[PDB]
Structure 1
Amino acid sequence: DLADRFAELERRYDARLGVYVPATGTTAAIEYRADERFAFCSTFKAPLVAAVLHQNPLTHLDKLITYTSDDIRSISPVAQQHVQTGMTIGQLCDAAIRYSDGTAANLLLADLGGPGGGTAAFTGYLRSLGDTVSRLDAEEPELNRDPPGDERDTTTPHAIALVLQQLVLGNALPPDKRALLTDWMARNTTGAKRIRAGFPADWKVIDKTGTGDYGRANDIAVVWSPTGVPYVVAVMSDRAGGGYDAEPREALLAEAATCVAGVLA
């Protein structure tokens, strides 16, 4: 039983686990705590890049953005190397997705603009995709820090899976912008030990990860079978029982994905 297995994993890792795979032709939806709120963490960067792509001509990607010392306030493996020179919007999108750069996300939020440093417009984008659940309230690093239970900066496995489905598989973006978003997620460097680890090598995996305080570890993916059948997989977890400093546990997501992969194979 799938639900029994997910509950076992929760006891093993002293964690709360959320899983959603939308229904397809012949497979029913997989759901475990799928309508419970979990912090976005860095998973919001996937729809953020889509929002920025949608809002502008494609050659906005070539616009240079400048920033400084006081702009580096969170984990930013790329933006710290380029503070002296600046980064184009395209470079910022690449870094936000592939390295989960926090400063890049902040700069992209500012580019989208409006109240709350871009967070209201970000939420507005999700609303336009029929998501009435998710909300973004703060930027990096505050968005990862809300107490367990707090609804600020949250999505649900269910809501984020439906958003990602429209972005990658549906027609939320035109084909050329859709391909840019897909390729970046395909070239993600942070996801090897999460959903990727649960699926056989001949299945294609594209993803965006999230990690935060209270043992928070997320992964949202689109996967393709060897025969080109796509599936959207959302896995979210936290470990509130360990407090603010609870270690995130990638292995939980890898195990949960393995259980998902077994059903879809």
Structure 2
Amino acid sequence: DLADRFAELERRYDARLGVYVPATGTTAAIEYRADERFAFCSTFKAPLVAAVLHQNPLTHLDKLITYTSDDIRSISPVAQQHVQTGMTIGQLCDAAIRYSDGTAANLLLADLGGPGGGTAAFTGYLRSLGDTVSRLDAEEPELNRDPPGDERDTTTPHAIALVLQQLVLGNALPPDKRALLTDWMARNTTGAKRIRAGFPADWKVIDKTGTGDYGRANDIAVVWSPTGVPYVVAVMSDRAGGGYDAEPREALLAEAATCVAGVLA
């Protein structure tokens, strides 16, 4: 019945909702518009941090990266505090995941592929995981403002969730790097009202958020049953009918999350 519950959500919130849960040994795949393109928004910061972890040794995460106040062209709650000072790569990692800091992500794009090569390098990291579908094509903020229908800066719930299944559950990162990426997203400061609200408290929840123009509201998460069996959950939405400044419905995502919680009991 999952499909019906989802379209009611869509009806009640007046939004496009894509859901994908990868199949486990015990359960089937929960998919809904899973292969339609949704904007990354800030969810690209999770597999980006992983790309930075993977290309470099952990020795890299203690390299002070310098930047200016005129480098803060997006929401940047942490990079705010180091106008000139600058931060360790590990610090920007921490800022781009848990705090969704935009300047953080841009310096990590730069670190990953040069001033005009980071978005393609980030996309190539995704291809190296078998995502031939998602593309990053801009830096912050403009990656949040691509018009609806455009393929730029889009992923799909199916492809990001498979990327996420690799990063946390598969061997895309080695135990250590993999472990730092899991603490970072398990501390995320931005995902209370999203998937976390949708899952029972005795279920573990680790997530990274995305929010943008046209009502875009996203949450990609790895979730753990009290038995400790792991699930990957991507929830992506937008409300593009309402224009660029339409209001994202976070409760939408929580609502989507309670349904997948329901067949995963």
Provide TM-score, normalisation by structure 1.
Answer: 0.99
Q: Secondary structure at the match of 2:80?
A: coil
Deviation at 1:116, TM superposition (A): 3.3
Q: Give yes or no for contact 2:191–2:209 (8 Å, CA) kept in 1.
A: yes
1:227 shift after superposition: 1.1
- Whole-Å Cα distance in 2 between the matches of residues 187 and 59 of structure 1? 22
Matched positions, count: 265
CA contact (8 A) 1:191 1:209 kept: yes
Q: SS where residue 120 of structure 1 aligns? A: helix
Q: Take 1:173 and 1:80, find their aligned partners in 2: how far apart are those partners?
A: 30
CA distance in 1, matches of 2:4, 2:151: 27
CA distance in 2, matches of 1:115, 1:24: 40
**Inter-partner Cα distance in structure 2 for 1:41 and 1:136:** 10
User: Take 1:256 and 1:116, find their aligned partners in 2: how far apart are those partners?
Assistant: 37
Unpaired segments ≥5 residues, structure 1 = none
8 Å CA contact retained: 1:72, 1:80: yes
Q: Provide the residue aligned with 1:98 in structure 2.
A: 98
CA distance in 2, matches of 1:56, 1:27: 36
Whole-angstrom CA distance in 2 between matches of 1:130 and 1:68 = 36
Q: Which deviations, in whole Å up to 9, do the C-alpha atoms of 1:133-161 show, x marking residues without a partner?
A: 00000000000000000000000000000
Q: What secondary structure sits across from 1:231 in the alignment? A: strand
Over the matched positions of the two proteins, sequence identity in percent amounts to: 100
Contact 1:46-1:97 at 8 Å conserved across structures? yes
Deviation at 1:114, TM superposition (A): 4.1
CA-CA distance at 1:59 after TM superposition: 1.0
2:92 and 2:105 in contact (8 A); partners too? yes
Looking at structure 1, the residues matched to 262 and 116 of structure 2 have their Cα atoms a distance apart, in angstroms, of 42
Question: Matches of 1:80 and 1:115 in 2, distance apart?
Answer: 21
Residues 3-41 of structure 1: CA deviation (Å, up to 9, x unaligned): 011000111111000000000011000000000000000
User: Does the residue aligned with 1:150 lie in a helix, a strand or coil?
Assistant: coil
Partners of 1:43 and 1:209 within 8 A in 2: yes
Contact kept? 2:120, 2:136, Cα under 8 Å: yes
Which secondary structure does the structure 1 equivalent of 2:138 belong to?
coil
Tell me the distance in 2 between the aligned counterparts of 1:96 and 1:115.
Answer: 18
Contact 1:115–1:121 under 8 Å retained in 2: no
Report the TM-score when normalising by structure 2.
Answer: 0.99
| Paired residues of 2:69 and 2:84 also in contact (CA < 8 A) | no
Kept in 2: contact 1:114–1:120 (CA 8 A): no
Pairwise CA distance, 1:100? 0.2
Could you give the per-residue CA deviations for residues 205-229 of structure 1, whole angstroms, max 9, x where no partner exists? 0000000000000000000001110
Q: Equivalents in 1 of 2:3, 2:48: separation in Å? A: 32
Does the CA-based 8 Å contact 2:217-2:249 persist in structure 1?
Answer: yes
Give the Cα separation in 2 of the matches to 1:249 and 1:193: 10
CA RMSD of aligned residues (A): 0.8
